[PDB]
Structures are given as C-alpha cells and as structure tokens.
C-alpha cells in the first residue's frame, strides 16, 4: 500500500472574489478544529496517510493553520498548504519553522495585471510571487495551480517562464470546471500556443504535471474541445482513490479524491461520513463502497478531473508507483 495523501477542507471563507469558485466572497464561519485534527491524526497514521494537504477557502485565513502544520509535522506528516498567496509572505516564516513541507500558489495569469483581475484583489499575483520565491529559500517545495480556459491561456507561455525564472518547481495545469459548457473559439490556437509549453525542455523550463489540460491523445482533445468533458484517468480503472482521502470539514463527507467533493452526480451527500457515532473515522466500509465505485466507473463518467490526478492514476496504471510528491 502506497503513501495516501489527505486533504482536509478547513474552511470554505475566503478573502478572494474568483468568478469561478464557490466560495468567492465566503465569511462562512466554519473552521476545523485542533480538537478534531488531533482525533484524526492517528486515524490517518494507521491508514497509510503520509502528506496532509490543507486547502478550503483560504486556509491562512484559519487562525491555527500554523498550529496544525507543527502538530502535522510531529506525527511525521509531510504537510502542504494550498493558498491564493495574498497573506503568505506575511505567513511563510512561520509556516516553515512549523515544519511545512510544501506551498501550492494559484496563480491563473501571466501578470498581476490579468490574475489580479480574475481574483479580483490587486497585489494577490506579487504577494503570491514574493512567498513562493521565500518558500523557496526557506526549503518549502514550491508549486503552481493554474486554473485554465479560453480566458487566459495565451498566458500560459508567459506564465511558465515566469515560474520558471522564480524557481516553481512543480505546476499544475488543468482546465476550468464549469456547469455550463465552455467552447474555446480556436482550438488549434490553443494548441499552437500551449503545445510549446508541454514540449519544452524539462531542464530548462518548467512543464506542467500528468495530463495536458485539453487532452493528450486527439479522441482526449476531441471530448475536451468539442464536449467540454475534461482529461481523467484513462485505462479501465482510476487508482487516485486508492491514495487520496479529501475531508469536507463543513459538512461531515470523505471523499476518495479532491474532485468528486466539488461534482454534482446525485442529490444526497456524496462521498461517506467522516464520523460514525461522533467518532472520526477512515476508510470506513460506506468509504470503501464510494471509492470502489469510482476505481471502476471513474474513468467513464467523470467530468471534473484534474490533470495531475488523471497523470498520477496512468503512472500507477502503467508503472505501479508514484514519486513522492506527484500529486
Ligand atoms: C478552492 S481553492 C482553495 C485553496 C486556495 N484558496 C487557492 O485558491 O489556492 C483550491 C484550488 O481549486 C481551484 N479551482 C477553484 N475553482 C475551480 C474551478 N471552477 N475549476 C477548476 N479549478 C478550480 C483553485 O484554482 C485552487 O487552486
Ligand atoms: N470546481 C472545482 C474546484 C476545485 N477543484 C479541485 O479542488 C482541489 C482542492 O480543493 O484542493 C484542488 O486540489 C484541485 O486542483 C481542484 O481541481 C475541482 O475539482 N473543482
Ligand atoms: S481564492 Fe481559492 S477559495 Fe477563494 S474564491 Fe479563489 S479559488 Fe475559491
Ligand atoms: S477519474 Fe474521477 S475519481 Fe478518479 S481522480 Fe479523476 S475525478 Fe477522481
């Protein structure tokens, strides 16, 4: 059994307006607490847990994330923090004496001047640039998610050197995730510009993780571009939910990856309860029976995968293992 990641939902408030998210504007007044992740934290040492990946709304917005990371850290989690960067320069020295392992920035622009606008906070593009380039020199491994679409993706070219030039040593690139449908005027523009930066020279330039976020193979690009129906893991089984475990800590569900929590699917609650009788629990058997469904359906009926976890569940299909930090 491999090194599982856990994700916990913090919070779901947030200090950004992104047109794309839920919790854009959220004072939601949730907040999980040192008291539950105290009670988690063997939970997921006996369930092969080994990265502990906080995100939400914004999770340094949460008073105790640093608290967290340090009690995290002490049990031997790798700990992760996923943040739009606007409060991290002021956060990354504490962060980084509590022991965390890795910084994931959401940058969806080339420039302040075009992610500034799609987030709608001026300074969040050179606040998260100043704390990626300090998580850097503090020994925080240093990721981007992008979020991509027919908005921006003439800056993706500009985007990657810009992490490149700033030490980024991992980025995420996956497609916006909408309800409604999403038509790109110009596919072949699309490829013509984004092409480049998948075939650029890993050594020199930094190339985003798994999949292209419109698909790699022209059946994957045909789904995408003319059905809106994004990349996911391919062959006949899904092993994401083998190793992902991601906590709605709002609500009570567990889900066995970090797309399924933010899909549509049935009506009642997805994923499992976290608690059985008050009591927090993992891997329990309504958990199993929702990943299990998943691991053989996934690749057939999900539309809202990401490009890093249709990458991570192929490498497993076709190599039987993962390198530490590929998800
Ligand atoms: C919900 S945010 C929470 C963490 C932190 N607030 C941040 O934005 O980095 C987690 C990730 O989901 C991404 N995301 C938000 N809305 C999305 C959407 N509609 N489609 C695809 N990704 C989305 C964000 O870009 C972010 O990287
Ligand atoms: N509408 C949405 C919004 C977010 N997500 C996923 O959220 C994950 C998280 O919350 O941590 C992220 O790791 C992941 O990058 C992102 O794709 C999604 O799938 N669909
Ligand atoms: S900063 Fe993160 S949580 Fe807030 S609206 Fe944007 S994507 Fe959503
Ligand atoms: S195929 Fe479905 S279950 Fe598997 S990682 Fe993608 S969204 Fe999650």
Redesign the pocket.
């Known amino acids: 059994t491999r090194e599982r990641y856990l994700f916990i939902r913090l919070l779901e408030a ?1 200090n950004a307006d ?1 047109f ?2 839920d ?1 854009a504007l959220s004072r939601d007044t949730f907040r999980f607490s040192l008291e539950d992740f105290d009670e988690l934290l063997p939970r997921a040492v006996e369930a092969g847990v080994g990265y502990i990946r906080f ?5 340094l917005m949460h008073t105790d994330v640093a608290e967290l990371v340090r009690r995290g850290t002490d049990a031997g989690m790798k700990m992760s923090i ?3 960067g606007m409060m991290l320069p002021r956060q990354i020295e504490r962060l980084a004496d509590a022991g965390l392992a890795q910084i ?3 940058l ?1 622009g080339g420039s302040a001047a075009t992610h500034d606008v799609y987030r709608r906070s001026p300074g969040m593009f050179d606040n998260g640039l100043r704390g990626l380039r300090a998580a850097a020199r503090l020994g925080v491994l240093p990721r981007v ?1 992008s ?1 991509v679409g027919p908005h921006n993706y003439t800056e993706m070219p500009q985007l990657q050197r810009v992490l490149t030039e700033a030490g980024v040593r991992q980025w995420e690139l ?5 309800e409604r449908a999403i038509s790109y005027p110009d596919p072949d523009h699309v490829r013509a510009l984004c092409d480049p930066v998948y075939d650029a020279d890993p050594e020199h330039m930094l190339v985003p993780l798994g999949k292209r976020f419109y698909g790699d193979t022209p059946e994957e690009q045909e789904l995408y571009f003319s059905d809106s129906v994004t990349p996911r893991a391919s062959a006949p089984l899904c092993h994401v939910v083998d190793d992902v475990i991601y906590l709605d800590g709002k609500y009570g569900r567990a889900y066995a990856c970090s797309c399924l929590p933010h899909r549509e699917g049935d009506d009642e609650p997805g994923g499992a309860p976290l608690r059985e009788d008050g009591v927090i629990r993992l891997d329990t058997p309504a958990f199993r029976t929702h990943a299990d469904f998943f691991r053989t359906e996934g690749p057939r009926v999900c539309n809202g995968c990401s490009t890093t976890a249709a990458g991570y569940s192929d490498d497993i299909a076709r190599l039987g293992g993962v390198r530490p930090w590929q998800y």
Request: charged residues 10%; proline residues 4%; contains cysteine.
């Open positions: 947030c992104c794309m998210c919790f995100t939400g709304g914004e999770p996923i943040t739009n994931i920035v959401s969806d998610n979020v996956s497609a916006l995730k909408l």
